[PDB]
């Protein structure tokens, strides 16, 4: 970045060809930024505003009758309940805008308005980063809430939570959703493995869900070459075939034995869809780092709520992005602050999978989304 007080000497009046810098700053003073609209949409569809609930209450035991008698009396019956809850992080962030009395006398108003428009875009970058590292950083976090400690969670990460049983399949401790592909390029066995790691917890197409995969171009260009019974990368053989979305470039159907998949519609949630393999929709996601895929469940019975909970401050006077008046004023120096505070956690620890394409070893957190790394 660039920083410190704005000074006379930072003011430019006209270019060498006589264009005023006021007219140049007036291009930036009011425009929305298309890239920060995209990042804001990724937050909107990947988060929910936190509300307080138990997790799903485990079902009570069931009774059975006894064969009666004319002299005796029957044996007695009983049951018991249990429940639990999960928590969410919170943190405070702030920026400064320091000036000199000469700068505010002499600078164009368009530059001040441009600095304000850039603070709103610094907020969009912060919230987006903090949502994405809630998903991609596979480490458990401590939080203190009202002076008590709590644990707040990524997806299943090889920890001692046991996922609940579904349709008679019982999971162990050490269940994990941060998967390594075991090969330099993605293949259909990686995609089928990852989608089944979601669908074993419920989240299936019969329960009315859609799975989505968000991926970088380097992995989509492998996936769109999967064809039924043909070999892929790493000697995998595809069990389905990739069907283009109706809006893609034209393609000849390869055989009278037509494609094993339904054709996707043009868009999901206002994002353009490349196509589908298995029943998952693939989306070219420009924010995604190169070696990674995010698989995500949506809709149906079990995924009506988005993956990441956003916690804001409990009092409305401290919610949102705020301007604080600052404590150098009028002359010789002027100061002003922007402040925002919020945090994040995952409730549905099985509702998504992160797959990393690398040859061997453990999962690596993407550097751009390591929890300590920065604020963008």
């Amino acid at each position: 970045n660039q920083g410190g007080y704005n000074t006379a000497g930072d003011i430019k009046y006209k270019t060498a060809d006589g264009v005023s810098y006021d007219s140049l700053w007036n291009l930036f003073s009011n425009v929305t930024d298309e890239w920060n609209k995209h990042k804001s949409k990724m937050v909107q569809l990947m988060t929910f505003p936190v509300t307080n609930q138990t997790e799903k209450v485990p079902r009570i035991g069931q009774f059975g009758f006894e064969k009666a008698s004319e002299f005796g009396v029957p044996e007695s019956k009983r049951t018991e309940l249990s429940f639990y809850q999960l928590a969410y992080d919170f943190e405070d962030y702030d920026l400064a805008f320091r000036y000199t009395w000469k700068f505010l006398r002499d600078a164009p108003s368009s530059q001040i308005k441009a600095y304000h428009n850039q603070a709103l875009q610094a907020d969009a970058k912060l919230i987006h980063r903090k949502v994405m590292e809630a998903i991609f950083d596979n480490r458990e976090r401590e939080a203190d809430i009202e002076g008590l400690p709590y644990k707040v969670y990524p997806l299943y990460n090889g920890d001692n939570m046991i996922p609940p049983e579904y349709n008679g399949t019982t999971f162990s401790t050490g269940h994990n959703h941060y998967l390594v592909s075991g090969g330099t390029k993605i293949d259909s066995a990686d995609v089928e493995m990852a989608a089944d790691h979601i669908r074993e917890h419920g989240y299936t197409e019969e329960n009315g869900t859609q799975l989505i995969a968000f991926a970088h171009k380097a992995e989509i260009q492998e996936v769109r070459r999967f064809r039924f019974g043909q070999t892929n990368n790493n000697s995998a053989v595809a069990n389905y075939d990739f069907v283009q979305s109706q809006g893609e470039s034209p393609l000849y159907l390869p055989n009278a034995d037509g494609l094993l998949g339904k054709q996707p519609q043009s868009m999901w949630k206002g994002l353009r869809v490349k196509g589908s393999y298995d029943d998952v929709l693939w989306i070219e996601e420009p924010t995604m780092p190169a070696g990674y895929v995010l698989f995500l469940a949506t809709g149906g019975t079990l995924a009506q709520q988005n993956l990441v909970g956003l916690r804001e401050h409990e009092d409305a006077a401290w919610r949102g992005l705020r301007q604080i008046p600052g404590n150098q004023t009028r002359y010789p120096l002027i100061d002003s602050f922007y402040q925002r505070s919020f945090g994040t956690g995952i409730r549905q620890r099985g509702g998504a999978v992160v797959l990393q394409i690398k040859a061997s070893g453990t999962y690596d957190i993407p550097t751009k989304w390591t929890n300590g790394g920065g604020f963008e």
């Binding site: 660039q2 410190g4 006379a8 000497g9 010789p332």
Partner: protein, 137 residues
């Protein structure tokens, strides 16, 4: 280099500049002192090292400059480096040559400590009263 925290009441002081500072010095940080006339010079004057100075644009002799003694300097790097690309090392002390006013990380008995860095690009200015060692063994 740039100022980012400055306190007009005892954090720094107004003084007149002894000579022109050219745009070749714009954005460099120098240690400065006061000459026998009462004007700001690079290095020690008669005063010893009085503080540190950055100008964002060149300035004429007899113009007034805000000399810093306590505060924070951002976009920081050693005086010999290119401003805005050749930044300082994180976590290290910085020392002024009393003859030229140049600031770098190399300590020396006749030099004056000007501050230390908190991350690469921020220097915490807190200028010493005198040289690192007045009495070498």
């Amino acid at each position: 280099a740039r100022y980012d925290k400055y306190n007009p009441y005892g954090g720094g002081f107004r003084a007149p500049l002894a000579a022109d500072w050219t745009d070749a010095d714009a954005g460099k940080l120098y240690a400065v002192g006061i000459n026998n006339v009462g004007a700001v010079v690079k290095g020690a004057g008669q005063s010893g090292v009085a503080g540190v100075l950055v100008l964002t644009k060149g300035a004429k002799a007899g113009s007034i400059v805000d000399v810093m003694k306590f505060g924070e300097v951002v976009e920081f790097g050693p005086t010999s480096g290119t401003p805005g690309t050749d930044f300082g090392a994180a976590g290290t002390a910085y020392y002024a040559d009393t003859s030229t006013g140049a600031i770098n990380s190399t300590s020396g008995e006749a030099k004056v400590k000007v501050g230390h860095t908190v991350g690469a690009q921020r220097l915490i200015v807190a200028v010493a009263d005198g040289v690192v060692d007045p009495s070498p063994a």
